[PDB]
Every structure is written in C-alpha cells, then in structure tokens.
C-alpha cells in the first residue's frame, strides 16, 4: 500500500526540495538536492487503488532502467495521498526550446544525430518492455550534443484529460498520436485504456523528425478537430516545401505509416538514419 524510498538502490539520506522548474499538466516539478535532482510531486485521490497498485509495478519496472539516453530514474516514494518521482536533473534546454530558438543552427547532420540518440534510448526502453507514450520535444533534453529522454510511461497514470462531455486537447498532443489512437479519442476516453504500442511511439518519433527540420509541429495552422480527421484518414505532410531530399522525407513516410505493421522498429529506424547524407 506504500513504497518506501529505502527500497531503492540509490542510497538516500536527505532530499531538499527547491524552486519550481516549470509549469506542467502532470504534477509539479521542483529542483532538488540529493547532487542536484528533479523531483516531480504527484497527488493521488486514494481511489482506483488497483490502478496505483499497477503504478507501483510500473515504478518498480523503472528501477531496472539505466541508459545514457534515458533520464536516470533515481527513486519514488509514496505516502498516499502524496506521491513523488525523483529523476536525475537534466541541465541544458528542452528540445522544444532549442528547435524554436533563432540563434541555434540545426543542419541536416545534427538533426540526423539528435534523432539517432532518441532512437537509441527508445530502443532500450522497448527492449526492456517499457512504452513511453508521451514522446514530445518537451520531454527530450539537449545539452551541447547530450540527448536524454524524459517522462516515459507517466502518461498511463497521468490524468491530463480529466468539462462535461468535452475532452481537453493541448496544442501539440494530437500531432504525436498515431491514427489508431486518434480514431479512439472520445470525451470520456482515459489514458490508462488507450491503445498505445511500440508502433505508436515510433509515430511520435516521426513527429519529432518533422519537428527537427520544419522547426515547428505539423498541422501548426489548423485546429484540433481538423487535425483529428486529417490524421485519422491518413493525411500527413512532407518536407519538400522546405527543400528536403527524398532521404529525409522517407523517414516520415515510414514512421507515419497508416498501418501499424508498416512502421519500423527503432533498431531498423536506427539503420535508416545511418544511411542519410
């Protein structure tokens, strides 16, 4: 009914909670001291006990994770109604902030390298049988060539969807969802029962690949309902309007494939990215 932070391999004596790092739909993310750390405080309503019973299992799954491209999960303590997820602190900037900065230059070679790093981390998480299901440029950090993935698996227990018969969509969420997920969305759909898969995470990476070159999300102009229909029927943009070669456009064609089984695995995707100019 509780998880102690003395159950963790990271030896824990004291934890200092600092300032808030930023605004976020899922809990509050504060600075921390352990070395500096990132503490995410969450509240559980003390209902769906069996769902948080699975939250504990998913957290213990994080314990077996360690990879240079995946944020170091360091511990988690649960004294209901309060939970806390403690991960290593990422210095640098989110890929969201980097991609939208005028001074930062993003040639084709660095975008190939940034993508390969995210693929390597996701390939590890898939090999360990872990689905990230909320891959965005706000959950990838970039510090002068160091690329780390963040917030994997949180979306299942997130509760970011919660009006009466009206589902909440944030700006960049829809364009990362594969068509099989988009066709499921409903005002009373919940994050725990959405058909996520390894193919859906590959689709989310395809969105990031578009974001790396266009340096903006796909379907930027259009409202949420138009995005839902266009993505559900399989309409997807390309990168030719900015002069990107076929090599860089084939990445999207494979990752954004309408049928799940046509999307490559991350190992195969790593091969594909190796063969770019």
């Amino acid at each position: 009914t509780s998880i102690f932070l003395q159950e963790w391999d990271i030896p824990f004596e004291q934890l200092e909670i600092g300032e808030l790092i930023g605004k976020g739909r899922f809990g509050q993310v504060y600075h921390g001291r352990w070395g500096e750390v990132a503490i995410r405080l969450i509240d559980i309503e003390r209902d769906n006990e069996d769902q948080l019973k699975a939250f504990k299992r998913e957290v213990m799954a994080y314990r077996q994770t360690r990879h240079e491209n995946v944020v170091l999960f360091m511990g988690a303590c649960m004294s209901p109604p309060h939970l806390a997820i403690i991960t290593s602190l990422c210095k640098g900037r989110t890929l969201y902030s980097v991609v939208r900065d005028a001074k930062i230059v993003l040639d084709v070679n660095k975008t190939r390298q940034i993508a390969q790093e995210i693929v390597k981390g996701m390939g590890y998480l898939h090999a360990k049988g872990i689905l990230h299901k909320d891959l965005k440029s706000k959950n990838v950090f970039y510090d002068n060539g160091k690329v780390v993935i963040t917030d994997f698996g949180l979306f299942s227990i997130s509760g970011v969807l919660q009006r009466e018969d009206k589902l909440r969509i944030q700006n960049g969420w829809l364009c990362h969802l594969a068509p099989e997920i988009i066709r499921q969305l409903s005002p009373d759909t919940e994050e725990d029962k959405l058909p996520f898969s390894k193919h859906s995470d590959v689709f989310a990476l395809g969105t990031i690949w578009y974001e790396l070159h266009a340096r903006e999300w796909p379907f930027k102009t259009q409202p949420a309902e138009a995005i839902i229909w266009q993505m559900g029927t399989g309409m997807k943009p390309n990168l030719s309007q900015i002069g990107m070669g076929k090599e860089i456009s084939d990445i999207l064609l494979f990752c954004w494939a309408f049928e799940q089984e046509e999307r490559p695995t991350f190992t195969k995707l790593m091969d594909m990215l190796e063969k770019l100019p």
């Binding site: 009206k166 005002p187 379907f219 259009q222 309902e225 138009a226 266009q230």
Partner: protein
C-alpha cells in the same frame, strides 16, 4: 444596415462608453457564474460580462493581443455584442462585453423542448447580417458560429459573440476543448482554403439542431423522430466529411426553411449559399416581414 430604433440604443451604448475608461480586476465584484462571469462594476454603474481566458506568455506578446483586441471598440452593430475593453489581470486575459440576460441559444434550447421555425427565421436574418457586417466592414470571418455563441436578451435583439478578431490569440491558445458536438465545416476539417462559407455551414447546422432539439449527427432513427414529435470523435468528424449532410424532417417545417438549411449545409463551399444569396432566399424575406414578439417568447419560455 439601417434602422432608427436600433440606432437609438447603439448610440446610448456609446454614452455608457464614456465612463468605461480603463479596467482592472478590483473594479469588479463577482455577481454570478454563467470562463465567463456576470460582474458588478463600481467606477461606473454598468453590470458587465467579463470573460477570463487563462494564458501565460511574455509581456510583449499579450500586448500584441490587446492591440488586436481593441479593434472591437471600433466595430459596432445591432447584430454583434458591444465591447467595453480588454485588460490583463492575474495572468488571465479579460474581455468585457455586454451582459445579455437571456443567455446563449443552446441553454435556452435546453430550457425549451424545441425552438419554433418563426423564431429561427429572425435568428437566421440577424446571424446573416452580423456575418455580413464583419466581412464587409472589417474583413473578418467569425470562425466559430454555434448556438453557444449567439446571445439573446429581454429587449428582443440577438447578437453574435466569440468571433475571431485577433490572429495572435488563435495561436496563443494553450489548448482546446473538443467534445461530441462539432460545428466545423467539412472544408475546414479537410484543411482546405475556407472563407465565410464555413460560417454559413455552422449557421445551418446550428439551425437544424435548434429546430429538432437534438444534435443532428448522426441522424436519428425512425423511432427517435416519432418520440420527438457512445461514438468517438473521429467517427463523428468522418461522418460530417463523407456522409450526406443532415436535413430537416419534411412534415413539420415549411419548404422555405428546409431549402434554407439545405443551401447552408451544401458540402461544396462554392455551391453553398453565400451571405448575399441568403439575403435573397425566400425564407428570410418571408421571416423578415413577420410580427413575432421575440421578447415575449423568451421571457415566457425561459421564465
């Protein structure tokens, strides 16, 4: 475009405009919830409707928002809601507008069973001329016509609100709320070029919903149509794009009304009736020359 009684109160509105000056939060006392709130202004005796939209962004960007929002001080029409001012308080932008004691058309449709054809005629005329005013006088389209954005009052006038006057506010929106009722035109769902024709579709779909008392997509079966007299979001949107548009029952409504909504719900926006063609349609010529006490219907219907 012309009337004297409508000019009588619109200039009196501009007499009440003098003491609005500038606005800040402490001027207001929360009266009730209608997110919008009915509020009591104390620097001037006006009771107002102040709408709060929660957005966080750098100062210069929302200053660009206010520059774009102050255009509403310029647009004045008996068919669009009047504008007081827009300030930024507590990280939530406020838009101060007329309080219309009748509410929106969706909650009065929730109050009534169905809305009769004669009232919907006057509603059609005012929405057409309101959109006409915006497009011809300010080069803007509404972009969000639906029953929840058409307001009524006990004086008897109806006005359009929540129309798109600012461009940066579109992008500045942090998120959006997508439910089971969608009023977006097919052409906008498919991401093609769109004009006021999309607002005409939204008007037509709003009219049929208010006429029958139910959101008309998907169409009801035979048993539900007699009694009147679990679907994902993508299934609805794909029904709007590919399946034939909704239509009124042929028994209880006049031909002029049925043809009017049919011309508004043509999928092809080039064939869809425009504001000018609607101004000539037989349905609104007939409705314009009718004696209907709209205030009497409202006050007796809502109570």
């Amino acid at each position: 475009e012309l009337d004297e009684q409508q000019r009588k109160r619109l200039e009196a509105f501009l007499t009440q405009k003098q003491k609005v000056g500038e606005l800040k939060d402490d001027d207001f006392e929360k009266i009730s919830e209608l997110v919008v709130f009915k509020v009591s202004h104390k620097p001037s005796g006006l009771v107002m409707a102040r709408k709060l939209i929660h957005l966080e962004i750098k100062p210069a960007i929302r200053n660009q928002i206010i520059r774009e929002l102050q255009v509403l001080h310029e647009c004045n029409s008996p068919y669009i809601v009047g504008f007081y001012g827009a300030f930024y308080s507590d990280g939530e932008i406020s838009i101060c507008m007329e309080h219309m004691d009748g509410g929106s058309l969706d909650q009065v449709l929730k109050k009534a069973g169905r809305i009769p054809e004669q009232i919907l005629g006057k509603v059609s005329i005012a929405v057409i001329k309101g959109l006409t005013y915006l497009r011809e006088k300010h080069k803007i389209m509404h972009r969000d016509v639906k029953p929840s954005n058409i307001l009524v009052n006990s004086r008897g006038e109806i006005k359009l609100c929540d129309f798109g006057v600012s461009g940066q506010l579109i992008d500045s929106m942090a998120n959006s709320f997508v439910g089971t009722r969608s009023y977006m035109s097919p052409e906008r769902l498919q991401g093609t070029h769109y004009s006021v024709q999309s607002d005409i579709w939204s008007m037509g779909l709003s009219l049929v919903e208010m006429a029958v008392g139910r959101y008309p997509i998907p169409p009801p079966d035979a048993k539900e149509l007699e009694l009147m007299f679990p679907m994902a979001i993508f299934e609805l949107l794909d029904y709007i794009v590919n399946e034939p548009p909704p239509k009124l029952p042929s028994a209880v409504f006049s031909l002029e009304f049925q043809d009017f909504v049919n011309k508004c719900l043509i999928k092809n926006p080039a064939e869809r009736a425009d504001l000018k063609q609607l101004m000539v349609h037989a349905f609104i010529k007939r409705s314009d020359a009718e004696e209907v006490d709209f205030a009497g219907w409202l006050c007796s219907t809502i109570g």
